[PDB]
């Protein structure tokens, strides 16, 4: 089974490009990272920064996680990210996504490595 750390990388890391290229970025990346296999994963976020910069966030601002746990960290700086959201018509196995490029602060939950 892949570990939680590996699934985090698969589902969210895209250090190969600095930002979403085109409106077809979500469509391609959701399929590519295998997120449209059994089902259409409804929402996903890709971070366009080095893995090192993303792992470093675990030593940045401590904040509460949405579930109330206390192991969440907020990046000090804004990061290049791409939000992928399933359109209303999209139907498995024809998964359609809207792509939104933005520069934001990410909040990650951290665990031992």
């Amino acid at each position: 089974k892949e570990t939680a750390a590996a699934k985090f990388e698969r589902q969210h890391m895209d250090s190969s490009t600095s930002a979403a290229s085109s409106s077809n970025y979500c469509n391609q990346m959701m399929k590519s990272r295998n997120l449209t296999k059994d089902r259409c994963k409804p929402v996903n976020t890709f971070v366009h920064e080095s893995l090192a910069d993303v792992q470093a966030v675990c030593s940045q601002k401590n904040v509460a996680c949405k579930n109330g746990q206390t192991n969440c960290y907020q990046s000090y700086s804004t990061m290049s990210i791409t939000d992928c959201r399933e359109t209303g018509s999209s139907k498995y196995p024809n998964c359609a996504y809207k792509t939104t490029q933005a520069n934001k602060h990410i909040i990650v939950a951290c665990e031992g490595n």
Partner: peptide
């Protein structure tokens, strides 16, 4: 040591 396991949110 400490590594990201979940993306809780953006901004």
């Amino acid at each position: 040591p400490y590594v990201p396991v979940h993306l809780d949110a953006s901004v």
